[PDB]
Ligand binder design. Structure first.
Ligand SMILES: [Zn+2]
Lengths: 95, 32, 287, 407
């Protein structure tokens, strides 16, 4: 907010940027491969339908309002056991 | 819902307190 | 050129010396030197102002008598504070205060002694009560027009400089001149005793004296202006009763037809002065 | 009351999560911390006495109540329990939520498999490099935008906006393509867009542990020695932009580089980066050199000290630090020292809700416009998220009354 009196204070704004990505990891490092669904329409997902598709972990980018329209993959192999209501790193449990 | 619908009204009571205090000092300041 | 943050400090005596000496010699630009302390790169602190003597009877012409320098600084050495000269000033009394050709002429000769000796312009005419108008400047070279002129640290000061501002010719003198912000710090001792002076010494000595004099007015002089008030509040009234009639006559509230108005509110405020100073009678006279 | 509330949660009702969204209600409208803990501490007694295993609620109270021993208790029980799948969520949300003193105080309780796990979960670097991997594999940008905002050439401050913009759209990508494509337009402004460029280098490299020092070894000041002052002074600032919120060999790296250095051109990036990596960490041995940085008797390094002297002591209110700051920033002749220490005394008090008010009244008292503005920043920072109407009265009141514009 106060950047006149020290012009390098335009640089602290990088620390304001936060991760918004839907992650999930089955061990400390292992990446499985899975794609789960969303309930919305495929045009609001854009960042320049029956379901949208996300990533398997890199993780997928996400909207803070699309955090509830996701659904854990009921038919694929790897399933997040914990209720997934935000992005970030969680468990992706194999059955 | 009445716990929420009763507790959230205290905020608006506090707000009307604030602005009723505030416009008095604004009115006094604007003549200066 | 290579710039810094733009900031000029003051002394409270400075502004008063500026206005007095620029008023007492008004139609000719009156030379004056400026005295203070270069504290750092970007703030300059004037603390003292002494005016220069005058000469032959012509506009804008200026001089620095070095024996006056030696003797004045010698007196300020035997005065409690000797310090370094920081620049100078004069007035542009009839206009929007830009440094003239003679001003930049003495500036290119005066700049070889000090870097940031800031030229300041007081104006005792374009200020009435809510303007200083303090107006200081800084000269640019011509050798460094191959290079840029534009670091301008603490950007707020420049955007603040463009608002107190007018002309086509100031706009033509953003070359050769870039100004510098002036601000004011006030001793709370000095602020409170100037408040003493000008919220207490406009009331007069022993403080009973003029209010008992108002009590002297309230039984000898007020009845004459009460007769004037009563004659006004008959004569104005029998024609301002035509006014809501004619409001019903002409239109719903259209443009201004003619001269007169109600004007009664002022006469009633004078009557309120009558009643408050009549209230003063019991309070002062008894006990 | 605590125990009749304990009776209401000991009922014969089908309660999946009434004891979770009522806790959301407990976090939403709470009067004081004196009552929040009194509600919260027996709820997790009934949770660890509840038949179903539940970890989100004990995680919730854990990050709330700031206990460096109960987290070690349930982590001991889940490592003893021998399932790292359930000892996962608590550990990584643990690293996510709370402060550095909390994790760096429970790390002793975790080393009081089990030795590798605490390194996995409390260092927590791999989550940052995981999202950094997302940021390098995911690149959805445009150069044409910067072409349109590039060919509006003016020699002005605009250079800083352009380099901060292409550091904005290239955060976490660790790519210097705007040091690849042009070399003379970068070299147009003097010393300040150059500090901004050598710090935009660090803006590209947020949370970047691996190639940090060896990527900025081009701009280490002891070898190349450029004629520009802040150009060689910006390397340590970019390093602190990299390693913010965490302390490593950067503390012990800059701690002797701020001793033996150039004049007050390098300290401005050095102490900023050092207290930025040590932000909220309460490190005493950077506060030590920040003392002589304060008493340099110069305000351009007075702002170095003014940022860092609060940065190292975020949310701590060291009662001698307040004394140091307000007792140096009254007799000074400058103003950068005043405003830097204004930000610092605002930054040292953070989330106290009543405990700042003795200072707040004192900062309201002074005739200094800078110090009244400082009290405004202090009541802004000590009340983050406070919906209480104690601050707002005097806050907006002096927003009416005071004569300076900046306040
Ligand atoms: Zn002139």
């Amino acid at each position: 907010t106060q950047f006149w009196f020290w012009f390098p204070l335009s640089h602290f704004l990088s620390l304001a940027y936060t991760p918004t990505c839907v992650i999930g990891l089955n061990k400390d490092l292992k990446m499985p491969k899975v794609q789960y669904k969303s309930n919305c329409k495929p045009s609001t997902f854009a960042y320049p339908t029956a379901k949208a598709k996300k990533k398997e972990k890199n993780p997928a980018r996400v909207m803070p309002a699309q955090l509830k329209v996701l659904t854990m993959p009921e038919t694929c192999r790897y399933q997040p056991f914990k209720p997934l209501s935000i992005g970030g790193i969680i468990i992706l449990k194999d059955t | 819902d009445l716990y929420s619908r009763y507790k959230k009204l205290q905020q608006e009571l506090e707000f009307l307190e604030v602005q009723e205090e505030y416009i008095k000092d604004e009115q006094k300041n604007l003549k200066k | 050129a290579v710039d810094t943050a733009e900031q000029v400090y003051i002394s409270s005596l400075a502004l008063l010396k500026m206005l007095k000496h620029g008023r007492a010699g008004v139609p000719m630009e009156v030379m004056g030197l400026m005295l203070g302390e270069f504290v750092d790169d970007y703030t300059v602190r004037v603390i003292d102002v002494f005016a220069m003597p005058q000469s032959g009877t012509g506009v804008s012409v200026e001089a620095v008598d070095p024996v006056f320098q030696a003797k004045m600084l010698d007196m300020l050495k035997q005065t409690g504070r000797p310090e370094m000269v920081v620049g100078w000033y004069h007035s542009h009394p009839g206009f929007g205060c830009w440094l003239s050709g003679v001003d930049i002429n003495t500036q290119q000769s005066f700049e070889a002694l000090s870097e940031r000796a800031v030229a300041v312009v007081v104006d005792p005419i374009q200020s009435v009560k809510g303007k200083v108008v303090i107006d200081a400047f800084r000269l640019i070279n011509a050798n460094m027009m191959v290079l840029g002129h534009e670091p301008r640290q603490t950007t707020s000061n420049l955007g603040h400089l463009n608002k107190p501002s007018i002309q086509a010719l100031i706009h033509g003198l953003n070359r050769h001149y870039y100004s510098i912000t002036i601000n004011y710090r006030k001793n709370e001792l000095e602020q409170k005793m100037l408040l003493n002076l000008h919220k207490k010494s406009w009331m007069e000595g022993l403080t009973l004296q003029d209010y008992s004099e108002h009590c002297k007015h309230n039984e000898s002089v007020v009845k004459e202006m009460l007769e004037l008030a009563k004659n006004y509040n008959k004569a104005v009234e029998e024609e301002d009763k035509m006014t809501p009639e004619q409001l019903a006559i002409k239109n719903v509230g259209k443009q201004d037809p003619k001269r007169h108005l109600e004007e009664h509110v002022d006469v009633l405020m004078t009557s309120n002065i009558v009643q408050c100073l009549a209230a003063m009678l019991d309070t002062v006279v008894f006990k | 009351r605590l125990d009749v509330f304990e009776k209401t949660i000991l009922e014969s009702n089908d309660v999946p999560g009434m004891l979770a969204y009522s806790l959301k209600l407990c976090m939403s409208l709470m009067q004081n911390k004196q009552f929040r803990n009194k509600v919260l501490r027996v709820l997790v007694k009934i949770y660890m006495n509840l038949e179903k295993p539940d970890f989100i609620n004990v995680c919730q109270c854990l990050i709330f109540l700031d206990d460096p021993q109960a987290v070690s208790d349930i982590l001991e029980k889940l490592v003893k329990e021998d399932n790292l799948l359930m000892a996962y969520q608590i550990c990584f949300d643990l690293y996510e939520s709370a402060s550095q003193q909390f994790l760096s105080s429970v790390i002793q309780n975790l080393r009081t498999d089990q030795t590798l796990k605490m390194i996995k979960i409390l260092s927590g670097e791999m989550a940052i490099e995981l999202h950094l991997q997302f940021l390098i594999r995911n690149n959805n940008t445009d150069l044409m935008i910067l072409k349109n905002t590039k060919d509006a050439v003016r020699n002005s401050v605009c250079h800083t906006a352009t380099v901060i913009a292409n550091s904005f759209m290239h955060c976490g990508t660790t790519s210097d393509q705007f040091l690849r494509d042009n070399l003379e337009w970068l070299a147009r402004a003097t010393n300040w867009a150059k500090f901004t460029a050598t710090a935009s280098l660090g803006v590209i490299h947020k949370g970047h542990e691996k190639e940090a020092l060896q990527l900025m070894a081009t701009y280490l000041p002891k070898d190349t020695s450029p004629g520009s002052a802040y150009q060689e002074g910006g390397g340590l600032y970019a390093l602190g932009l990299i390693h913010a919120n965490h302390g490593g060999d950067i503390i012990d790296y800059l701690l002797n580089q701020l001793k033996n250095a150039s004049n007050d051109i390098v300290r401005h990036g050095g102490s900023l980066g050092l207290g930025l990596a040590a932000m909220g960490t309460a490190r005493q041995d950077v506060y030590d050199l920040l003392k002589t940085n304060l008493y340099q008797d110069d305000a351009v390094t007075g702002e170095a000290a003014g940022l860092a002297l609060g940065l190292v002591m975020l949310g701590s209110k060291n009662a001698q630090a307040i004394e140091d700051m307000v007792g140096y920033a009254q007799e000074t002749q400058h103003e950068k020292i005043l405003r830097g220490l204004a930000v610092g005394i605002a930054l040292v008090m953070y989330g106290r809700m009543e405990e700042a008010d003795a200072l707040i009244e004192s900062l309201c008292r002074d005739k200094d416009p800078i110090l009244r503005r400082s009290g405004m920043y202090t009541v802004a920072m000590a009340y983050c998220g406070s919906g209480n109407n104690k601050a707002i009265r005097r806050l907006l009141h002096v927003a009416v009354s005071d004569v300076n514009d900046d306040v």
